[PDB]
Design a protein around this ligand. Structure first.
Ligand SMILES: NC(=O)c1ccc[n+]([C@@H]2O[C@H](COP(=O)([O-])OP(=O)(O)OC[C@H]3O[C@@H](n4cnc5c(N)ncnc54)[C@H](O)[C@@H]3O)[C@@H](O)[C@H]2O)c1
Ligand SMILES: NC(=O)c1ccc[n+]([C@@H]2O[C@H](COP(=O)([O-])OP(=O)(O)OC[C@H]3O[C@@H](n4cnc5c(N)ncnc54)[C@H](O)[C@@H]3O)[C@@H](O)[C@H]2O)c1
Lengths: 262, 262
């Protein structure tokens, strides 16, 4: 088995998908999970106006709306959470995503105060954070906010992770990686677009140096996930990120694990 | 296979252990991991003066000290982090644990400002947190601080999780559960004490209504983990917590998972 085959199998990616089938698979997964744990009443999701959260938000609201009609349980709620860093105006993509999703509830939580407070406590301890590490700090504060909301609303936190994000480990460990249920896991980036098109999402919310990584485009990543043969330089770069970030796609390491050993 | 057998097997717990052997197993695991990823230079751990962090701290410092002597790499460092909630004096158990461990570096980060800032942002969004949810918030802020320190020191975050904590899911999801490497995983509570005794730890740092859960003592939990037959009421309570918290011991849920299905 080649490394490309191992990566594809681990992430569950397929060369082609039926969008209507995948929309239903995701919605029914969310519903079946909620029905298994009937004390759960909410799906919680950070929304930004980006492709991934717009898709996961639409699927989550559909799951809730259907289950609410079937069970008559008016306590069931989809909770969209805007998580801006600072009072930085109001973005149109996010507003358009909200109009499309029609969420039951929208909460807005400004994470800047907490991130700055974390930084000051570290500063007093003698540690000055870089801009790079502060980005991960922000992602962890967004995780924290969603978990606090879930904690107060019998909720679970929906994640936007999918194959085209996971392959390179291009997410923050216990930040946007810290979630409960991931309805987009298996899909590549262009496939996410096919689902949004099938759902009637406004094209400007998903229609596209813009690259996934240095010298690697999203078309490169999706082609790799679909089993295609790329330039060895592109494939090697993709494979290098996957191997480097194995720790992000596995549970904390114990004396029983062997995957990391040479 | 009974549920007790499944739990024991999943957590890796044994009826009896050789303390010297287990000390070495844990120390050598930490060293071998660091040698596999030679860009890593630090082990980072929150210390409180409690049994679990005192044990994981001593093992971590031994790993670093040995690897530093073997490789001559003076950049290798064990970083102990005090994480008080507020300027609440200086605790003797923590000071005694530091004296025993002799850590290379000790950092002190007051998490109260950030937790209060998180709470105020939620308050403005219309969400008032309960004391219970605030406890989980604090655990997540401690995670955040350790990850920021790791991010600035080529570090990995050591976790204190072990069988007697994991069985009931008595940890915060992505809080003290959010770690990189767990050298105590497999051990029950009394076994942790045997390792500390073998290491010459001051008895007051590990020698013991004080109960693990309602109507369940740590002796009950350890006996269950060692395969003993308890009162059905105690066993049922333990088994109920395990089943309820399966989600805490698994990766975010995807359409491919079947463990949660009835
Ligand atoms: N080309 C790109 O666009 C690109 C490239 C790299 C990273 N990313 C971005 O950077 C951010 C993530 O940065 P990150 O990965 O430095 O932060 P992270 O916090 O997600 O992961 C780093 C942390 O993981 C732990 N760790 C590191 N190596 C480990 C190992 N071998 N075993 C166990 N644990 C280990 C350490 O605690 C470390 O602090 C994301 O936003 C990501 O998308 C983007
Ligand atoms: N008897 C005791 O001493 C006792 C009893 C219970 C809890 N604990 C303590 O309480 C704290 C943890 O509380 P917690 O467990 O409420 O907080 P947590 O944040 O660790 O876990 C709750 C979160 O997990 C998610 N979740 C809940 N059910 C889920 C499910 N079925 N599937 C997927 N995700 C799900 C939700 O996001 C929820 O907000 C810890 O300090 C723990 O030790 C102690």
């Amino acid at each position: 088995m080649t490394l490309q085959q191992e990566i594809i199998q681990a992430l569950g990616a397929k060369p082609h998908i039926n969008p209507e089938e995948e929309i239903r698979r995701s919605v029914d997964f969310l519903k079946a999970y909620l029905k298994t744990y009937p004390f759960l009443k909410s799906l919680v999701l950070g929304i930004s106006g980006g492709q991934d959260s717009t898709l996961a938000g639409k699927l989550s609201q559909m799951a809730i709306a259907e289950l609410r009609e079937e069970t008559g349980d008016n306590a069931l709620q989809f909770i969209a959470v805007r998580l801006p860093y600072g009072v930085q105006a109001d973005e149109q993509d996010c507003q358009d995503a909200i109009a499309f999703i029609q969420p039951d509830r929208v909460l807005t939580v400004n994470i800047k105060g907490a991130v700055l407070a974390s930084e000051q406590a570290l500063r007093e301890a003698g540690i000055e954070l870089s801009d790079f590490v502060r980005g991960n700090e922000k992602a962890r504060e967004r995780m924290k906010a969603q978990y606090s909301i879930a904690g107060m609303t019998h909720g679970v936190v929906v994640g936007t992770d999918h194959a085209a994000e996971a392959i390179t480990g291009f997410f923050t460990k216990y930040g946007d990686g810290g979630t409960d249920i991931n309805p987009l896991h298996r899909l590549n980036k262009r496939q996410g677009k096919q689902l949004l098109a099938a759902l009637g999402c406004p094209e400007h919310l998903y229609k596209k140096p813009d690259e996934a990584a240095l010298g690697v485009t999203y078309d490169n990543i999706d082609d790799y996930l679909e089993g295609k043969t790329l330039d060895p330089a592109i494939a090697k770069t993709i494979e290098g990120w996957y191997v480097k970030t194995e720790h992000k796609r596995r549970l904390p390491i114990t004396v029983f694990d062997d995957f990391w050993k040479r």
